[PDB]
Design a protein around this ligand. Structure first.
Ligand SMILES: CCCCCCCCCCCCCC(=O)OC[C@H](COP(=O)([O-])OCC[N+](C)(C)C)OC(=O)CCCCCCCCCCCCC
Ligand SMILES: CCCCCCCCCCCCCC(=O)OC[C@H](COP(=O)([O-])OCC[N+](C)(C)C)OC(=O)CCCCCCCCCCCCC
Ligand SMILES: CCCCCCCCCCCCCC(=O)OC[C@H](COP(=O)([O-])OCC[N+](C)(C)C)OC(=O)CCCCCCCCCCCCC
Ligand SMILES: [Ca+2]
Ligand SMILES: [Ca+2]
Ligand SMILES: [Ca+2]
Ligand SMILES: [Ca+2]
Ligand SMILES: [Ca+2]
Ligand SMILES: [Cl-]
Lengths: 376, 376, 376, 376, 376
């Protein structure tokens, strides 16, 4: 992920122009090789036309250039790219939202699975660890980075997400399908056991735990589905073919022809097709948006930071359910206890935000007449 | 389903160009017959114009070609295709999401329907089997592959999704409408019975079971609705007519005319309409995206793998509610028990992912001045 | 509804071409009158130009044709049609999803409202009948077909959805607004009564019943809202005017002019504006998609089959809550009881679906090196 | 709201053509002044060119007309209008769906807040009245019509939505922000009190009441947010500027030039720019769709009927929770009690809907071969 | 936020034209510098061409202008801008909806956490303060304005959102990740404690509290995700490059050439490229919509008013859970107690809204024939 939110907090004169000076996750980094290849083919054709071809071959080449320039229709490709890239971007965001996070579970577990003794700690930590383990199993199934970090289940065990006895149970299960769901079933069994023992004090709490468990498990499964059900291959091929057909038509039709021949619209030979190169950058980069996001769990600069998320989720969940369990500060009167109203101070840099009227609703400046306000 | 996610993990120089070398689920496999027919008509017209028609007929043919080329407007067809194909693709994904999965139910059942004895096993297995049976009944109603696998209810019985006594009850129900919902009602009755017997220990657990049951049943019904309510036929006909009208205009108007006649824009005769063929591939393949996805439960390469899903769902659900019931590893101290913090190791191939700053929020580099930070 | 899902299970060579041979719900059935009128006006103008007008009038007519052809801009109309028709299609699907179905309620009622005696049957049947009655009242308010079936409340009573005493209570309620909601309030009161009597055994079950009741009632109300809040009239008028303006410009500008006059682009007189007629079919049919779906509760071929749904919902709900109540087959060992794994057989026509690898995740072919897999 | 749903139940030959004869909520009513102004400017320029300007001034005017006609590019404006108007229409529907309705609350209250005595009536009526009062407070904050009906809180009190003692409490609260939420907090306190007194019989019922209360309150708050967070002003200004730039280019470039000058494409002087006027109607009306809907709580013909909804919601809620409380008809055998199946009659006008096959699923006509159906 | 809802309540003749006279949040304020730069470059080139270049240089310049004008294709940029800006606007609204509000929590807390004594007040106030504190921590992480108001945690403590003892606990937690979630875990622990002490009277109430807590926490986390996962940088760069390429092509190709040279379409030299400047305003302002909204938590005029929301949320939550706790007006007969029906009065300005028929449904004017209404 290349976060540039801070850079675009305000719409400034430099604005998005500043972003053109970024390299990581940039269009340049993703497209310079393709741009070099396109320019190489264009210049090879231009050099042949300028130095190799005979006069008759040169006339035929000019004829072909004129014919080919007619098929560089950018409107169709613009359409198909817009629709396809929009689909891919929306799917990219949906996939990010399907990342399984433990926060809801950790809040519930800290609030419902009780006991300061070692057994209560074991319950809370084990529940959260099962959640993290399910997330790890699915992510290593769908994320190249996570797989490289956990290339075998042994690595998961050595990382401490799975115990040796748990690994015995995990392998002993006879299934040919991805077992990422197994720790969720373990979670359910352990929660039921905790309720039976009274560590969970009420049936509503167990219901809440199971509900949040199923939310988390469902997000895991959604990651599996997105990984399995690619964007339809035919659609990706169609868009790629459309773009490459336009680029072929441009590679031929944008050749600079000898101005002496006097062809209509071929009178200036810049020797470098500047605007065609800009158009190539535009359209190829538009498709590169899809190329990068179509699988957000790769190692692209803008692919999701899955390993960082694994680390953060584990650390925070453990903190919340173990160190923070039943560890409140003493209830004390807050600063605004005796104040009927309340408003925190403003700094010098922000007090200007005050004196802006507190919006009450769009209707409170109509200022009707007295005769209008009398009830029938 | 043709999964190529692994191939596009990273945006690479080859990128989507590599995908053009795939056959299964490809544009080529879906369109080569139509391309051959289009080329055959084009070449038949060209051969007539070149070898059969008289001089006067040839002049009239050239006139008609010039007239027809004016109506090859690709912008309208591009519009209609974009909107229609986008509708179809979104509906395709929605249908996939409506596939009924047992995972939520199996977690709840493993956590709430109790007893290691044979009766507890019977309860858990029967509940999950009713879920699977409902899924089978709807899928055989909507999926050609599943129907071919279960062409009659007798096949469902022999597969063990339905018992002989259950089949007697199923047929004895007098209804002219699809009975896919029947096992859901059986599920509800059985859950209520289990609660009455105390196999389900609390009313909240029964409520949770019924809630997840209705989620699953609703997904089944959504499959029925999608199967019944086709994309409006008039819309599909409109898009097909638009595309074929463009292709007619191209079949005539893209004919190569004798360059000797000196017609404007007809000076080069390539004898093969390369860019028109590419445009046909583009647009016809764009519509073929819809043709493949408009019913995702067929046998296309990119249609959903319904039978694999039936097998996986049954096997996993049975595992989770029977073999994994109350079969936890002993609660033991985890690797990070004594660690206030925690972070699993990184492999050599991934340690580079570390040393990337842990994002805290976009605001934490503003670096205000001392006088700005004082409260009013 | 014209269901053609079976026809498009696979993308075939004939593909959507076969659909062009369908009449029910077709573009032809919806547009042949408009096509005849358009052709009649075009041919009347052509006949006047060919046989009535004088030479000077003929020259002025040619001038006007040339001027008018300039304003046949299809891109604006294509835009407006795309956006408007897409809005209408999405709203069409949303309306279908707002159809009130009893399945969730019937599952809950069968599972929660108890007693094999006549009073338990009365409770279950009456609850489901109240649901069906609310659906009938709203549908007769919004569906022309349903209204024709139930033109007065007396018809509802004779159909048995409402009892005579219920009808007395219904009419005695003093309200000038649609009373479709009344049976939902009756449902709530009856459920509360059943809980008081212990026919509903727990408060969680009553809560679940009321939750599903409100889901159903909300769908009824959504039907009322969609019926009341039309697509904004100004938008429909705008799209209609845009389309008719294009068709006016075409009716004039596509007239075939005397080739002898030698006007640019007017050299061939086909006497039938084939491609203009195809364009009219395209664009007018695109709008006809909206014309049919803008109210899906009419009697169009592709309008929803509301009466069939009323019949099916009533019959199935009654079956589920009366005949199927507490009528399970004896719990028996399933076919896969002794099998650690499980997989139902495949038929000859489908065994080929096997031997396709069971997808495990996109990451499981990376095949890293030994030195890469060592933890830091 | 201008409801024309009945008019478009079926796609008819007249179809949307009939809608062009409507005035209320019409494009004509919203645009005739702008059309008159556009025509006035056009005709003033034409009259100057025809009767005031000298020959040299006339030549310069023709030059300027030719130059200006080049910038009447309708594709950009069509794009921006499509995207912007679509945003506004979707937001319009979302706002309508955020209208707070009491139906869910009234069902729950009738089912859960008990007692036929005056105190039970007081509880039920007061709860529903608090809901209605919150709706009134927010609507008078966001709806010009509602504000005109309730220009001061005194009007709310005299309308009986708020009592005098309640008004004392309401004003005594020290807050500078809109207090529409206050009756929701009152609702919560009153529900808790009713539970303490046992008028609400169980904790699940209180939970359900509070859940629906928060749904209702959230809809109120969503109305506040939509009122506060306008469509970004810059976007509205951009679209307006684009449209007016096109109309400027047309006002100049569509002037009819003297045909004697022999300018290309200026040979016919109709003296009335018919198709330009139609284009103005099209595009300006397209923007007028947004102008009307951008605030749906005004007094436009197609703005929401907020006061009618207030009246209906109050009357229906009071009916449901007071007159209909525990007022069921005696449970009696329904018409289909003894019938294993059930189907209500059809009228003469609708019996034709029967004999249409009952859809069972798209797979049930495949008709496989005997050898294909044998299990492996 | 620049609220102009009141201004566009009705579609008026002035309509959106009035909005063009606004400065705050306007296109002018966001774009005048860029417009000045564009005009400066254009005029510098024009002055060079008019006063510096030699005759031969002038001919070459005219050649280059003619060549460059060919690449000012506005359709591609219009496409990319439409799709990209639409994505950004939708994301903008989603982010606003992810703002964490306490209203649901405050209703629940006022209804479920009991006791008029100081301890009950402490419980209620502390719970709501934890919610507000979590919101403050995330907002200061994502909002430049809020960060400037709370540049250090010490400022949060002095504002009274966090207590000194709470701050000790907060810093003592060993985590390298944003701790905005910590007060949510505190909230959960405190709610569990209150239930143990009986301040919360039932387990359903605690479940409801935890559910709403997780809703609020999830909104906080969504703010973090939106802040972290920027709109993909490559996409923003692509759109910026497309726009700047068009503006380059215009800066060259829209130069006014000497009319004496007699170039086609270069005959009038206005010396100011009015319509090109309008097009620049259009397209650059369209992108400025994205530039402003891409981070809505900055200090743009149309960025969200985060500090106002913090103040309002804290003040209202405290009011609701402390001053309004168990402080109802005595239950009294409402104005419509004895009225079977009910309707509040209308004012003179609004009585016209009456006499509009109360909509009952679109079907109630069909007026069938007697023979049509008889049941079969
Ligand atoms: C005029 C353009 C349209 C041409 C129409 C298609 C002509 C190609 C026919 C290919 C027949 C493949 C036969 C097959 O059934 O083979 C299966 C096998 C598995 O396929 P799989 O690996 O995808 O699984 O095939 C493979 O192993 C890999 C097969 C590689 C396919 C290469 C063909 C595409 C090249 C077209 C290039 C277009 C212009 C650049
Ligand atoms: C100029 C283009 C517009 C022409 C306007 C339509 C002209 C065709 C009139 C068809 C009258 C059908 C009468 C009918 O009501 O028949 C019902 C019956 C059931 O219809 P069903 O099977 O759909 O159910 O009809 C059937 O059985 C199958 C009927 C087959 C319909 C064939 C007509 C479409 C061919 C147009 C081709 C367009 C150019 C390629
Ligand atoms: C150049 C194109 C723009 C022209 C601008 C509009 C000119 C028409 C002015 C109509 C004044 C209507 C006065 C009115 O306020 O009348 C109310 C009454 C109820 O209206 P309501 O029934 O909708 O409810 O009016 C009715 O009863 C039915 C009224 C029928 C309206 C017919 C006017 C539209 C015809 C334009 C055709 C455009 C070219 C084909
Ligand atoms: Ca990637
Ligand atoms: Ca298919
Ligand atoms: Ca219809
Ligand atoms: Ca309005
Ligand atoms: Ca901003
Ligand atoms: Cl619950």
């Amino acid at each position: 992920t290349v976060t540039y939110t801070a850079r675009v907090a305000n719409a400034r004169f430099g604005g998005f122009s500043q972003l053109l000076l970024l390299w990581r996750g940039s269009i340049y980094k993703l497209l310079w090789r393709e741009l070099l290849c396109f320019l190489g083919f264009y210049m090879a054709l231009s050099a042949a036309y300028r130095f190799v071809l005979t006069e008759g071959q040169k006339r035929y080449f000019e004829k072909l250039v004129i014919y080919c320039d007619q098929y560089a229709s950018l409107i169709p490709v613009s359409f198909v790219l817009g629709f396809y890239v929009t689909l891919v971007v929306n799917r990219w965001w949906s996939q990010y939202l399907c990342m399984p996070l433990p926060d809801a579970l950790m809040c519930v577990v800290a609030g419902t699975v009780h006991g300061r003794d070692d057994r209560g700690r074991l319950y809370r930590r084990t529940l959260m660890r099962y959640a993290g383990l399910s997330a790890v199993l699915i992510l290593r199934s769908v994320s190249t980075a996570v797989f490289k970090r956990f290339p075998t289940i042994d690595h998961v065990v050595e990382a401490g997400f799975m115990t040796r006895e748990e690994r015995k149970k995990f392998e002993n299960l006879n299934s040919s399908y991805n077992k990422y769901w197994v720790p969720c079933v373990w979670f359910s069994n352990l929660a039921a056991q905790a309720r039976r023992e009274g560590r969970i004090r009420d049936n509503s709490a167990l219901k809440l735990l199971l509900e949040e468990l199923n939310v988390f498990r469902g997000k895991c499964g959604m990651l599996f589905h997105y990984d399995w059900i690619s964007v339809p291959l035919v659609y990706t091929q169609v868009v790629t073919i459309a773009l490459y057909s336009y680029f072929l038509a441009c590679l031929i039709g944008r050749q600079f022809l000898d101005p002496a021949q006097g062809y209509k619209d071929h009178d200036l030979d810049l020797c470098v097709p500047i605007f065609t190169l800009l158009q190539f950058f535009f359209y190829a980069g538009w498709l590169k948006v899809a190329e990068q996001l179509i699988n957000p769990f790769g190692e692209d600069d803008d692919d999701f930071e899955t390993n960082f998320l694994i680390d953060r989720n584990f650390q925070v969940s453990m903190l919340a359910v173990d160190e923070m369990y039943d560890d409140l500060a003493v209830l004390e009167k807050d600063l605004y206890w005796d104040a009927a109203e309340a408003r925190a101070p403003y700094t010098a840099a922000t007090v200007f935000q005050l004196r802006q009227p507190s919006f009450q609703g769009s209707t409170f400046d109509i200022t009707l007449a007295k005769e209008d306000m009398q009830f029938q």
